[PDB]
Structure formats: C-alpha cells, structure tokens
Design a protein around this ligand. Structure first.
Ligand SMILES: NC(=O)c1cc([N+](=O)[O-])ccc1NCc1ccc(C(=O)O)cc1
Length: 282
C-alpha cells in the first residue's frame, strides 16, 4: 500500500495482521487489516453500507494485487485492554450499563439488517474518549467463515448446530456483560468440551424441558454429565436483580427463548441509563 503510511502493526487480528495507518493523501488515520473468492468480495462490500454509531465503520474493501485489505475507522482502545486496566477497581456500573446499552443498539441495528457477528469478544469491542463503544468485525464471519477463544461461544454452536441465528450474539454479549461486572471471564473454557461443560456446570446441563430439541443436536451425547443449575446470585455478584434478570434472559439455552437486542433495550435495567466519560489512558 503506497497510498498508506503504516504507523505501526497493532496486532495479529482475527483474519490477519492489522496496522494503524495514515492515508498519505487525506491524512486520515485508519486501521488496515490485510486478510489471509468473489462471493466474499461482494458480501464484504455490502457491509460498507452498514452505518450506525455503534458499529465500527468499514471505509473500504480493497482487492488489489490479488490481496484483500479492509480499511476501518480507527479507535484507540479495545474493551479487553480497558477491562484489564480497570481490574483493580472495576468498571463503574453506570459505564457498564452505558456500554451494554450501546452494544445492544448496535446489535439491534445489525440484526434488523440480517447481519450477524458470530464472534463477539472484548477484543472486538472498541472504545473512544467520548464514552462510545462500537462493534468491530460485524458480518466477516459469514462473508468468510471456514489460539481461538471459545469463551463467548453460544451453546448451540458448541453442540454443532450449522445454522446460527441472531441469538448467538446475544449470548456472547451476555458473557461480556458478566465479565465487566465480576472482572473475571464467565466461561473460560480451554477446549470445546471444557467450554461446554463450564457452561453446563453453571447453568445446569440442558434437557428437553428447558431446551426443546437439544438432545437431537449434532454433537449432543447422552453421556454428558448432568449438572444442576446454580443461582445467578452466585454467578455475577454483586449485580442487582435488574441486571441478573437481563443477564438470565441473554443466557437462556434455547436460542428461541433468548431475549432479542430490541427487547433487551426495553429491559428495566436500562431505566436509568446514562452516558459517562471513561477514564482512558492512551
Ligand atoms: N478499527 C480499529 O481501530 C481496530 C481494528 C482492529 N482490527 O483487528 O481490525 C483491532 C483493533 C482496533 N482498535 C483498537 C486498538 C488500537 C491500537 C492498539 C495498539 O496500538 O496496541 C490496540 C487496539
């Protein structure tokens, strides 16, 4: 890229290396991701039309010299770093609520346009000095697909379901909501089965009563141990009942019972939502 002036490599992103770069002409500072099919090109291109304040803007999709580059609006920090930086004192509840509320607005928008994320995690939630938080990498999993963190994966994906639904994003966001609250990942699995069993150990091994059709899932085994469900009061203390109620609805096993982003925005937990300024050290 002669048009760009690589300011520095900022990591080995999900689909390849990413650099902070400055457009030599416009002078704009952007994030440039070089990706490792005409089908993908078209899908990816469609995402350039997906604009919302809580979605990281995809500025350009460049297919040149038979290589793929994605140009994104730049944000200085991700939620994973912010959480680590806030680990001693914890992110204040008003800011956790503001962030959750904005992320749900972003999801509601994407989902209303039939676009799924599929791989939400703290690392792809970007924040700025003005108190905004934005979802990065929306739609890339589908446009592409085919050590990976499993911590935020919905149980239907772990059980081998081949058709994802918007519910997988709500599950991931519930896991992130819990992590901001407790300052510890909710389900830190280190293998697909450890991930699944960590979920079962906390929410109870699912059965046909709470999840109709679960025993017919591709990777379900009658041999799975049967764990009893624990109480949310023990899961995300000291979160209040409004928060626990919303989290419980975001973590329902049955994707069809899982709350939608639109419905979650109307949950009583957000009655007093505000938009605080975070303490950001850049
Ligand atoms: N749009 C983007 O600004 C961005 C993009 C990616 N990415 O993998 O495509 C990954 C992280 C991003 N920002 C947050 C960020 C910025 C700088 C640094 C750093 O300098 O270490 C780390 C994270």
């Amino acid at each position: 890229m002669e048009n760009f002036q690589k300011v520095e490599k900022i990591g080995e992103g999900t689909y390849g290396v990413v650099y902070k770069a400055r457009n030599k002409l416009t002078g704009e500072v952007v994030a440039l991701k070089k990706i490792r099919p005409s089908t993908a090109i078209r899908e990816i291109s469609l995402l350039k039309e997906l604009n919302h304040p809580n979605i990281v803007k995809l500025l350009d999709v460049i297919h040149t010299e038979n290589k793929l580059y994605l140009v994104f609006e730049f944000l200085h920090q991700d939620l994973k770093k912010f959480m680590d930086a806030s680990a001693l004192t914890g992110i204040p509840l008003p800011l956790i609520k503001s962030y959750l509320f904005q992320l749900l607005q972003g999801l509601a928008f994407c989902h209303s346009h039939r676009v799924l994320h599929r791989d939400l995690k703290p690392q792809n939630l970007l924040i700025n000095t003005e108190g905004a938080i934005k979802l990065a990498d929306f739609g890339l999993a589908r446009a592409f697909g085919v050590v990976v963190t499993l911590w935020y994966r919905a149980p239907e994906i772990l059980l081998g379901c081949k058709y994802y639904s918007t519910a997988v994003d709500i599950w991931s966001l519930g896991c992130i909501f819990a992590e901001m609250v407790t300052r510890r990942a909710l389900f830190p699995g280190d293998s697909e089965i450890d991930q699944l069993f960590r979920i079962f150990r906390t929410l109870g091994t699912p059965d046909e009563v709470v999840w109709p059709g679960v025993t017919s899932m591709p990777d379900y085994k009658p041999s799975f141990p049967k764990w009893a469900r624990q109480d949310f009061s023990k899961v995300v203390p000291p979160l209040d009942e409004d928060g626990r109620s919303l989290l419980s609805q975001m973590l329902h096993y049955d994707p069809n019972k899982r709350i939608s982003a639109k419905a979650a925005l109307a949950h009583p937990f957000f009655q007093d939502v505000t938009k605080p300024v975070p303490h950001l050290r850049l």
